[PDB]
CSV table of C-alpha atoms in Angstrom, one decimal:
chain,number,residue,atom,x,y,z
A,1,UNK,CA,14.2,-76.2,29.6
A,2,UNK,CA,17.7,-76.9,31.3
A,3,UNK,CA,16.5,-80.1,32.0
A,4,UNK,CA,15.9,-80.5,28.5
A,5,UNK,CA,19.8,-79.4,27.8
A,6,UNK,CA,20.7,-81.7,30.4
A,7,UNK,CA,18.4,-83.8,32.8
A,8,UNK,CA,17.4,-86.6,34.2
A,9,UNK,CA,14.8,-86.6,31.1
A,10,UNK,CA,15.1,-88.5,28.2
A,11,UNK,CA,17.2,-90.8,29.2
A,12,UNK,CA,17.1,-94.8,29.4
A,13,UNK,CA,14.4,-94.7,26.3
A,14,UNK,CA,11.7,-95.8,28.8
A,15,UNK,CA,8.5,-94.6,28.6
A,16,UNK,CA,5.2,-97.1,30.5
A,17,UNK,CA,3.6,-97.1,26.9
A,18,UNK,CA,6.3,-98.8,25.3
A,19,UNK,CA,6.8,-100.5,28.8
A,20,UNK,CA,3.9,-102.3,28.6
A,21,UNK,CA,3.7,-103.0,25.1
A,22,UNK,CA,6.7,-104.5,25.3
A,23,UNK,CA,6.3,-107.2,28.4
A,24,UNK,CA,2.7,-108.2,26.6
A,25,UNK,CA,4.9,-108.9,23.2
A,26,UNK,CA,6.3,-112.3,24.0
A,27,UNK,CA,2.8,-113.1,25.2
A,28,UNK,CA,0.6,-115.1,23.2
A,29,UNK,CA,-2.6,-113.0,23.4
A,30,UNK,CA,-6.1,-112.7,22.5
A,31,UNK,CA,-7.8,-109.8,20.2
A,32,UNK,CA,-10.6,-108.5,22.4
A,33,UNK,CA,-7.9,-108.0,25.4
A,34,UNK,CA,-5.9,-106.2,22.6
A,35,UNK,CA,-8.4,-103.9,22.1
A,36,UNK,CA,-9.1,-103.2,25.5
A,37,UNK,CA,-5.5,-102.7,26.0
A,38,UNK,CA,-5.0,-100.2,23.1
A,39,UNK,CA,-8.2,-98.3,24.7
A,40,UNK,CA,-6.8,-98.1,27.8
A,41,UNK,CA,-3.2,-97.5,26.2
A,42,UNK,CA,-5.2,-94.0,24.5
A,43,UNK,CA,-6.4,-93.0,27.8
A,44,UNK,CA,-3.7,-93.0,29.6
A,45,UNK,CA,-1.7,-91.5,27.0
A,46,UNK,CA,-5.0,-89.0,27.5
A,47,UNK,CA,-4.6,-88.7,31.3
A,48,UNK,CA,-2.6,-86.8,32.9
A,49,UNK,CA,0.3,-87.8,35.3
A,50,UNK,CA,-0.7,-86.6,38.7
A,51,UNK,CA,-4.5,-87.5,38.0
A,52,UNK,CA,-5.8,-90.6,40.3
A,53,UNK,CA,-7.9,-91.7,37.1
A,54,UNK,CA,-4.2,-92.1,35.8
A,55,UNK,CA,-2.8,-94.1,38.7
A,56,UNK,CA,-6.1,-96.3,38.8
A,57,UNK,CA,-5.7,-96.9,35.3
A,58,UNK,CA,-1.7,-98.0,35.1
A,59,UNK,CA,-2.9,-100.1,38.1
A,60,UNK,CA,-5.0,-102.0,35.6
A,61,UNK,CA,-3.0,-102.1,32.6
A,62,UNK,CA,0.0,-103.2,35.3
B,1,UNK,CA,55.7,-55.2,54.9
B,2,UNK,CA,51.8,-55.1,55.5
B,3,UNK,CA,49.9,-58.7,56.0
B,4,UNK,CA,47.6,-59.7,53.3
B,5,UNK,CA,44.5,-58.1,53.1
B,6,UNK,CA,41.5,-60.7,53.3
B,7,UNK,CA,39.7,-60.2,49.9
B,8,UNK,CA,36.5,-62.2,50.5
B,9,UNK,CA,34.9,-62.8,46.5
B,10,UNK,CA,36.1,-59.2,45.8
B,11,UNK,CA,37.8,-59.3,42.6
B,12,UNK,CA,39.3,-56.2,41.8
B,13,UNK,CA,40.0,-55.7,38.2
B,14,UNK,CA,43.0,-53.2,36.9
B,15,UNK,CA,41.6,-49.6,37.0
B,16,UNK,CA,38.6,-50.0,37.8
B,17,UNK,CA,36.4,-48.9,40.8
B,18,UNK,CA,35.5,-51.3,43.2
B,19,UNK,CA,34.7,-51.7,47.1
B,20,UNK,CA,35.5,-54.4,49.3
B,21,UNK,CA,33.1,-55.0,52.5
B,22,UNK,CA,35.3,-58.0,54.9
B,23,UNK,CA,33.3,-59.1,58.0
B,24,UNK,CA,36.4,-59.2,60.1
B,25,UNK,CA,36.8,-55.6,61.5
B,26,UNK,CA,40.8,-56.4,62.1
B,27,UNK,CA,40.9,-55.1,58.7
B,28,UNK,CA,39.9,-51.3,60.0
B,29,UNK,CA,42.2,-51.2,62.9
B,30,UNK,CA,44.8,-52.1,60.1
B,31,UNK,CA,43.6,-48.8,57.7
B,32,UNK,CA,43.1,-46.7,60.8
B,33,UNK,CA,47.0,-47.5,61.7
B,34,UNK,CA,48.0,-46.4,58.2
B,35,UNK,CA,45.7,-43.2,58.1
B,36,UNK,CA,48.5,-41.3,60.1
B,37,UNK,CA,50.8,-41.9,56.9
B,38,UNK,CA,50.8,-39.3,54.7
B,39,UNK,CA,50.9,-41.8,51.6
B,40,UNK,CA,48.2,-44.3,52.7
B,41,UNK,CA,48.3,-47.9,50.2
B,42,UNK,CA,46.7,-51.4,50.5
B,43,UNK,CA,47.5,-54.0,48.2
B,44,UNK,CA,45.2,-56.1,46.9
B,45,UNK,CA,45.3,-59.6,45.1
B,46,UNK,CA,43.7,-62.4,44.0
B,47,UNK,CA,42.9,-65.4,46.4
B,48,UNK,CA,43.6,-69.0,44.9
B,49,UNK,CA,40.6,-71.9,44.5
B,50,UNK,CA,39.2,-73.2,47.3
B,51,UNK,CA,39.4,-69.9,49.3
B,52,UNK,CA,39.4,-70.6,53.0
B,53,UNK,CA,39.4,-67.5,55.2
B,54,UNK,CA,41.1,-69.4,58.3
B,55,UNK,CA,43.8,-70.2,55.7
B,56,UNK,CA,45.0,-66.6,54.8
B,57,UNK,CA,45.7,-65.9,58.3
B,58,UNK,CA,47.6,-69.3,59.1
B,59,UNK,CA,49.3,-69.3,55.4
B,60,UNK,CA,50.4,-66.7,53.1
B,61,UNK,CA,50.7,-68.7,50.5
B,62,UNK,CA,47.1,-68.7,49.6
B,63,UNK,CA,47.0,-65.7,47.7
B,64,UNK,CA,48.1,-65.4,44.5
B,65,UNK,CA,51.9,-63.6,43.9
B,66,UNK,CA,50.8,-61.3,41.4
B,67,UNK,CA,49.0,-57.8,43.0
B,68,UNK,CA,48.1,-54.7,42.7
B,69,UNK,CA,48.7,-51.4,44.9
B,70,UNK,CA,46.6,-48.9,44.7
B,71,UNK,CA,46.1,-45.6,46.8
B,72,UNK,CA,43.2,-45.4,49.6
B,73,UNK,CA,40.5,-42.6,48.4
B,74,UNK,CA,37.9,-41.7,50.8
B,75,UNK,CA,36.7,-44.0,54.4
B,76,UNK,CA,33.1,-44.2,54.2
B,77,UNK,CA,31.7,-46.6,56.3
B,78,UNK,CA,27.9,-45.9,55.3
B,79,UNK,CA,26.3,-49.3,56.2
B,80,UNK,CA,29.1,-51.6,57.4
B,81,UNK,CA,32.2,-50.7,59.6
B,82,UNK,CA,34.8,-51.5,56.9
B,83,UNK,CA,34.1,-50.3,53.6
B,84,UNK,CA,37.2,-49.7,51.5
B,85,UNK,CA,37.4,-48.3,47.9
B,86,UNK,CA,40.0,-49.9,46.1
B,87,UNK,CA,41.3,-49.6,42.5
B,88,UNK,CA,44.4,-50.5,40.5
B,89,UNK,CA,47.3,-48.8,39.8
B,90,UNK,CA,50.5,-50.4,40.2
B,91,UNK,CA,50.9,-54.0,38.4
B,92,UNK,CA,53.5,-56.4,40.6
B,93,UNK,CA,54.6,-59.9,40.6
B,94,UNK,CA,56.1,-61.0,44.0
B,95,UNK,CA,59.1,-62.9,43.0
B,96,UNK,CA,58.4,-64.8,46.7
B,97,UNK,CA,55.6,-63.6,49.0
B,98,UNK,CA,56.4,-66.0,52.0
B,99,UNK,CA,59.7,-65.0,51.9
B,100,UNK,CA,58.2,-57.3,51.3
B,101,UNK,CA,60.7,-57.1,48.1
B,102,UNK,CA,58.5,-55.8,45.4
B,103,UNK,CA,59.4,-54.6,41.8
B,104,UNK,CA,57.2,-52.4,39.3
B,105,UNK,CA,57.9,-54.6,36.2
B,106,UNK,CA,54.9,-53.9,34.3
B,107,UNK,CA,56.0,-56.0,30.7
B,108,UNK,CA,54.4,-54.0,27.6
B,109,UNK,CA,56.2,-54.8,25.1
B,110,UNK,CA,55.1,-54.0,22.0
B,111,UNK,CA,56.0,-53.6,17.9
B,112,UNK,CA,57.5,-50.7,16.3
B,113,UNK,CA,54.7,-51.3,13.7
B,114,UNK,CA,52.1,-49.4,15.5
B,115,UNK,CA,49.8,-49.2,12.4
B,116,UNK,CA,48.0,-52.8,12.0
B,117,UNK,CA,48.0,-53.9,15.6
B,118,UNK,CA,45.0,-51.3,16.2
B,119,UNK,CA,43.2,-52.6,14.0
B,120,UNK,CA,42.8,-55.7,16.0
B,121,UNK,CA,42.0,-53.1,19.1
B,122,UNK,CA,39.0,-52.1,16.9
B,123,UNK,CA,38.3,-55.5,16.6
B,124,UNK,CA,37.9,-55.9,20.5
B,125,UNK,CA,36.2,-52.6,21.2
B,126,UNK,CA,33.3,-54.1,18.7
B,127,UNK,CA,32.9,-57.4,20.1
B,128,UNK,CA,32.6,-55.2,23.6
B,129,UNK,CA,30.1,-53.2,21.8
B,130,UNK,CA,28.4,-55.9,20.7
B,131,UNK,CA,28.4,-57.2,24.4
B,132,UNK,CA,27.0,-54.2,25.5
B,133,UNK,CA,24.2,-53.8,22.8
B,134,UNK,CA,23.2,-57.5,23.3
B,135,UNK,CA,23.8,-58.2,27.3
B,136,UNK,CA,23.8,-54.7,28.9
B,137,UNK,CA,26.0,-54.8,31.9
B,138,UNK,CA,27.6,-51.1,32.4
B,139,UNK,CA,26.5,-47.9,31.2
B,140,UNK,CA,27.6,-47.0,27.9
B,141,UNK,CA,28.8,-43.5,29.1
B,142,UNK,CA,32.2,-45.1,29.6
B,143,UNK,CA,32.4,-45.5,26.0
B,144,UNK,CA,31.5,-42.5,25.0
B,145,UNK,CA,33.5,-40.5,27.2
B,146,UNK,CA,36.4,-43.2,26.4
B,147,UNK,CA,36.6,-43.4,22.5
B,148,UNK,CA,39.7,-44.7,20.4
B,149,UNK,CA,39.3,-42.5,17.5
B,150,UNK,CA,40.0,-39.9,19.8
B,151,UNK,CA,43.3,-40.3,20.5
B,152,UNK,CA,43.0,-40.1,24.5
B,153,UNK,CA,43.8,-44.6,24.9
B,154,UNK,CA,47.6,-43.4,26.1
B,155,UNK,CA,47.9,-46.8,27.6
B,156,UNK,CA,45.8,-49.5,25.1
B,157,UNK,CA,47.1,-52.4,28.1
B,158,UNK,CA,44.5,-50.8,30.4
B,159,UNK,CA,41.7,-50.8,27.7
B,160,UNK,CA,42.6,-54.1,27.3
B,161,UNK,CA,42.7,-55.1,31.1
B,162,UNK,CA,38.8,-53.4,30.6
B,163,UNK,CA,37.7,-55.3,28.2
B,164,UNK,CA,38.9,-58.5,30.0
B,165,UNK,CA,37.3,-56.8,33.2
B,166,UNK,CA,34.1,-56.4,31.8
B,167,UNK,CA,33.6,-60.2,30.8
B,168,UNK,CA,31.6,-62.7,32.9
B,169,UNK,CA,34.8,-65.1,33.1
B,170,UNK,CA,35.8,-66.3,36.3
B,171,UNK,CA,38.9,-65.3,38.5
B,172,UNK,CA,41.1,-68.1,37.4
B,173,UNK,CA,40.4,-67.3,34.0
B,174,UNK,CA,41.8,-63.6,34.5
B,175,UNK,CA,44.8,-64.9,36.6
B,176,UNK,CA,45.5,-67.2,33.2
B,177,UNK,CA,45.5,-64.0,31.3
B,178,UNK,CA,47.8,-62.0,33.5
B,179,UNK,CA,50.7,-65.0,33.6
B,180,UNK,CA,50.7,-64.6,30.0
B,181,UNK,CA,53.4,-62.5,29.5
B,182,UNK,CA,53.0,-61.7,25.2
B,183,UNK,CA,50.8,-59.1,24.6
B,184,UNK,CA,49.3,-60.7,21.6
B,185,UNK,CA,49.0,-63.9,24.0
B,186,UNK,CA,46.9,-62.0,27.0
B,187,UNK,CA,45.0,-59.7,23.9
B,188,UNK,CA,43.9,-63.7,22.2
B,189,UNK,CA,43.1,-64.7,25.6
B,190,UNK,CA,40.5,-61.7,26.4
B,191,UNK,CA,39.0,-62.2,23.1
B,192,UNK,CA,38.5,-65.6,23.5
B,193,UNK,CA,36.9,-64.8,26.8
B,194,UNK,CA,34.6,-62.3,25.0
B,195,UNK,CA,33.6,-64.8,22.3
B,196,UNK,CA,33.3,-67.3,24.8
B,197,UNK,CA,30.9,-65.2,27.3
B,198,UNK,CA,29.1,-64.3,23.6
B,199,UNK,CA,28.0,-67.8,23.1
B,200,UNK,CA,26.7,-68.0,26.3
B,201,UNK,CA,24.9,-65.0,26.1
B,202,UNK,CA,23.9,-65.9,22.9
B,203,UNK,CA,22.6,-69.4,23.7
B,204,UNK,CA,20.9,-68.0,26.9
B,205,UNK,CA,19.2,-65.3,24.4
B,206,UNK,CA,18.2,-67.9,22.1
B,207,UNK,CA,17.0,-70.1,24.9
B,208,UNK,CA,14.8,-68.0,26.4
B,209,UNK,CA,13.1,-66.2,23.3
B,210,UNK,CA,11.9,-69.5,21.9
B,211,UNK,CA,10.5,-70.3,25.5
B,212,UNK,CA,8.3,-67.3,25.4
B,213,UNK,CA,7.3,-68.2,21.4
B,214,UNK,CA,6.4,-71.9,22.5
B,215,UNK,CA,4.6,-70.3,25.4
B,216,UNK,CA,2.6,-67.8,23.2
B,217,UNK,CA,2.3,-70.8,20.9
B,218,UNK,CA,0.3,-73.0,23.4
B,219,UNK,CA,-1.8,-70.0,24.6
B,220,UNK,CA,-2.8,-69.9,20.6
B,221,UNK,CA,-3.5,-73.6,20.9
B,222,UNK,CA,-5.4,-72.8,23.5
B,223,UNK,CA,-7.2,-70.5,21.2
B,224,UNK,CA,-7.6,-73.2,18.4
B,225,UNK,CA,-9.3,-75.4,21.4
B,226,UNK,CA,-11.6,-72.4,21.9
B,227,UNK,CA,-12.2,-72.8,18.3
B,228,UNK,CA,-13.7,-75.8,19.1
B,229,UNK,CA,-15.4,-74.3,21.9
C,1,UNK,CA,38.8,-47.6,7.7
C,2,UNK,CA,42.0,-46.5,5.9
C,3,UNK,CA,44.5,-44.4,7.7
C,4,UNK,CA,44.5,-40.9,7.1
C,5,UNK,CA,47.9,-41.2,5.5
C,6,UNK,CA,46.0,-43.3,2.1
C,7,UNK,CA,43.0,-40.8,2.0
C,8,UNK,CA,46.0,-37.9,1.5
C,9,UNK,CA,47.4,-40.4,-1.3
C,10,UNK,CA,44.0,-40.5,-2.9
C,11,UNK,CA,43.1,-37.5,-2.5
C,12,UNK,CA,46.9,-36.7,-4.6
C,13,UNK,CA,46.1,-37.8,-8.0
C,14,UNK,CA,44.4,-35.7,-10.4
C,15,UNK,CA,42.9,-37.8,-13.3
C,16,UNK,CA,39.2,-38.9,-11.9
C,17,UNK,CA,40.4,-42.6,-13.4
C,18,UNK,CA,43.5,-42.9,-10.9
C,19,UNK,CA,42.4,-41.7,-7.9
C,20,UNK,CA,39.3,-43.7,-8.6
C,21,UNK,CA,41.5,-47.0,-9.7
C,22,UNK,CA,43.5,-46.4,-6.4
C,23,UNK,CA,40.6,-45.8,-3.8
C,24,UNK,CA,38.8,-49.5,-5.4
C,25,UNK,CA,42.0,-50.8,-4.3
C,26,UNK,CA,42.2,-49.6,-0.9
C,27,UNK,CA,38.5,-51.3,-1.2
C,28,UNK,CA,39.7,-54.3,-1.7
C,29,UNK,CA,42.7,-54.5,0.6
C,30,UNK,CA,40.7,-53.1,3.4
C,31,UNK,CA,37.6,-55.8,2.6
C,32,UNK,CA,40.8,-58.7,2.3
C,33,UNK,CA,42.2,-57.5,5.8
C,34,UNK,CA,38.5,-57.1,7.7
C,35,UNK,CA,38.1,-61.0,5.6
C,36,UNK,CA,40.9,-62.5,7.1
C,37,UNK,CA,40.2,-61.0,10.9
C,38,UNK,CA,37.0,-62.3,10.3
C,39,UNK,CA,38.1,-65.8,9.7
C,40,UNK,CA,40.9,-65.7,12.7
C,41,UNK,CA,37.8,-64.7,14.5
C,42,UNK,CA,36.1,-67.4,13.6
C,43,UNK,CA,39.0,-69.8,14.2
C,44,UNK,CA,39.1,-68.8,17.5
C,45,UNK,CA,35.4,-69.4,18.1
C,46,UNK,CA,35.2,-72.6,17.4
C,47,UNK,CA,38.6,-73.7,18.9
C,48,UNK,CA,36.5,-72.3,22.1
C,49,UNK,CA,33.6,-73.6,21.2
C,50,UNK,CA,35.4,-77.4,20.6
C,51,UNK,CA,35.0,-77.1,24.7
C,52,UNK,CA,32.2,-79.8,25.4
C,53,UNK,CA,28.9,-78.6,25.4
C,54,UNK,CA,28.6,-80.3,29.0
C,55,UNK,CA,30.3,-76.6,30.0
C,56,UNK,CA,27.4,-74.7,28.6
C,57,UNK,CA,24.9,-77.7,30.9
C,58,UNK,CA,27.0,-76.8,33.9
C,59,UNK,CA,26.5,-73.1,33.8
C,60,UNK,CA,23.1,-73.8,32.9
C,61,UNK,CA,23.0,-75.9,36.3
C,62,UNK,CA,25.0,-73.2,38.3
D,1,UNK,CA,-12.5,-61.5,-2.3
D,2,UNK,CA,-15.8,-61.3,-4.8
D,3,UNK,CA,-17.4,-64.6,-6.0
D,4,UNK,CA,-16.5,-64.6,-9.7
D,5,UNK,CA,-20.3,-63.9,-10.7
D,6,UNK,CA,-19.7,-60.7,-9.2
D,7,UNK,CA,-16.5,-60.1,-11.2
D,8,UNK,CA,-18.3,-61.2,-14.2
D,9,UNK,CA,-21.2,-58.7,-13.3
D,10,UNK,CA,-18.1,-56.0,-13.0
D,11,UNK,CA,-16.7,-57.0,-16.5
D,12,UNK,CA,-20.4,-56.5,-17.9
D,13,UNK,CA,-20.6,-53.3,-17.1
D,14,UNK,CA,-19.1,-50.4,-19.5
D,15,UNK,CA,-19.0,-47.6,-18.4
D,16,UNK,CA,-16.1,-46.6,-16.1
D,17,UNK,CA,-18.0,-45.4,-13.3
D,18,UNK,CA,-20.4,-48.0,-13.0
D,19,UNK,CA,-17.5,-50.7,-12.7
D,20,UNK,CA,-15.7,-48.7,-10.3
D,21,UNK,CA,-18.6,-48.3,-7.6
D,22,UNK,CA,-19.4,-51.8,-8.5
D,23,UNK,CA,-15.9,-52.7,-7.6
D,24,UNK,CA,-15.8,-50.4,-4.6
D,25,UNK,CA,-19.3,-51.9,-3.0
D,26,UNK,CA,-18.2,-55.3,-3.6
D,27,UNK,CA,-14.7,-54.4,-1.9
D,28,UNK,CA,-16.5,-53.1,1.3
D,29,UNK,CA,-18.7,-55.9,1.7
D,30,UNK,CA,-15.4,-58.4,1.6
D,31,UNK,CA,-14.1,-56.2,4.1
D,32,UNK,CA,-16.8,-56.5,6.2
D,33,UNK,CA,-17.1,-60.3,5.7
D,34,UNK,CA,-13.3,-60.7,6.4
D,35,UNK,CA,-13.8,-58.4,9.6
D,36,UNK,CA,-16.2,-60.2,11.1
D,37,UNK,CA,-14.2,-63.1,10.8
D,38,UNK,CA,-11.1,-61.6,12.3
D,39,UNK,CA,-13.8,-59.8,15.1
D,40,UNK,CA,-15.1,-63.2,16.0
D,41,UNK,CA,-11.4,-64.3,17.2
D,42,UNK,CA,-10.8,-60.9,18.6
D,43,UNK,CA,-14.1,-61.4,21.1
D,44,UNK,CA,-12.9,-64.8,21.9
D,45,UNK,CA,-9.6,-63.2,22.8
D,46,UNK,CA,-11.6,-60.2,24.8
D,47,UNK,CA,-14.3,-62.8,26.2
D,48,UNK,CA,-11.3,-64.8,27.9
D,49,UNK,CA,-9.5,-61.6,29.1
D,50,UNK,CA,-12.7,-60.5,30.9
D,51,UNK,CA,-12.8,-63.6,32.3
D,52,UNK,CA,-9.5,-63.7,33.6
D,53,UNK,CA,-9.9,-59.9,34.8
D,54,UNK,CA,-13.0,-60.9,36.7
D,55,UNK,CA,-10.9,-63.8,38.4
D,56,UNK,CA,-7.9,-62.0,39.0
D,57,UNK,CA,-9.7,-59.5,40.8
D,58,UNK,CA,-11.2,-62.6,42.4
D,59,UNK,CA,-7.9,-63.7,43.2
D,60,UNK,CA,-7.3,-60.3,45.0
D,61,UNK,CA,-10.1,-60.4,47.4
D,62,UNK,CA,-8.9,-64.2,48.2
């Protein structure tokens, strides 16, 4: 909660969902893979941080 | 003509009880020399930022010149070798401490009109009330036994150097209170220190009760989960 | 909280309407004075509390 | 919380007691639809404190 008053949080506006969605925008890309990404996008939003599920799936998206 | 007494994070406040434990035992071969007297007094004061015990021996200058001497009570020594009860009773500003020449000129000046400055007294004693009904600190048997209707504040300046005691601000702030000279000045300062410590008390309150509602709130979302379950 | 001195002044006039008219306007001089504390008060509080919020974050740190 | 037939049975009746212990039964049996719904919630909140006894006693012997 002090980090919420002050922390390293929040800052920069940077978050890996909007990350991603971001570098695949000036791409010129396919539906199917769209799906797929939005699919994964909802699990990972799902999935914990510290979970290995997590890491193995933002290796993928990356 | 005594050498300053190293005060080591001991702030003691005007008139009120406090007891200063110093790791250097130089300190009791000092009051044991002035036990013989048959008017033992230390002085004590307040040390500037940055406090540096190696300084206060090498430089006098350290401390601040304003002081306060009070009159030594009882030698206890319970758990440490030096244990020294120290309170305040005589105000001084050293017009030079390197250069002791000291001179009781305790300022209270004050108006002939003693009828509406109390009321602003009142208003102090209930913002300290309020302190002490929101952020308990001290027993409230002080107050009791210490009430303003009752006639017994002979000397409001000490209620007032309470009131500022009392308050979570830090040394300088205090040592900016007692250069004020103006009554009404030092009075605006203390209660500017009391609303200050109030919002942070306040804030802190406020913090920490909606961190325990959030919490009970996500052990009843926990429950509306077990109503799925 | 009137001093003693008004409640003896109050408690001097005979007609019920007098001392009645006189004690609503010790009310009302007593609210105006316990008014205008209150807004000095409040003046104060927020010339204190024009102090930067990063204050409050440092004490929160500390 | 009667269904309205069962206000509209109260209204039929005409004499006074009859309503009343009509109104009285159908008052219980609310009550006692309404606490078993607040009873169900009230085990789930003792089911999961067992549980976390039986662990925390768990937690002592480990």
């Amino acid at each position: 909660i002090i980090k919420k008053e002050l922390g390293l949080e929040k800052d920069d506006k940077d978050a890996i969902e909007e990350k991603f969605r971001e570098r695949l925008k000036e791409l010129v890309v396919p539906k199917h893979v769209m799906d797929v990404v939005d699919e994964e996008l909802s699990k990972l939003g799902l999935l914990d941080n510290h979970s290995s599920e997590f890491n193995v799936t933002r290796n993928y998206l990356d | 003509h005594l050498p300053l007494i190293a005060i080591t994070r001991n702030p003691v406040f005007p008139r009120f009880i406090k007891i200063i434990e110093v790791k250097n035992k130089k300190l009791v071969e000092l009051l044991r020399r002035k036990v013989r007297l048959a008017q033992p007094y230390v002085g004590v004061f307040l040390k500037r930022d940055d406090s540096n015990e190696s300084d206060v021996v090498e430089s006098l200058d350290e401390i601040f010149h304003t002081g306060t001497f009070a009159q030594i009570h009882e030698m206890q020594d319970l758990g440490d070798k030096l244990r020294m009860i120290v309170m305040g009773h005589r105000r001084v500003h050293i017009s030079r401490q390197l250069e002791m020449v000291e001179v009781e000129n305790v300022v209270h000046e004050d108006f002939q009109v003693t009828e509406e400055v109390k009321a602003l007294t009142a208003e102090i004693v209930k913002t300290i009330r309020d302190i002490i009904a929101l952020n308990p600190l001290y027993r409230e048997s002080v107050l009791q036994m210490m009430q303003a209707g009752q006639r017994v504040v002979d000397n409001p300046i000490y209620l007032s150097d309470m009131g500022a005691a009392l308050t979570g601000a830090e040394s300088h702030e205090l040592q900016d209170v007692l250069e004020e000279t103006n009554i009404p000045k030092r009075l605006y300062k203390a209660l500017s220190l009391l609303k200050k410590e109030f919002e942070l008390s306040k804030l802190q309150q406020r913090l920490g009760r909606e961190v325990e509602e959030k919490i009970k709130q996500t052990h009843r979302k926990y429950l509306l989960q077990e109503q799925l379950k």
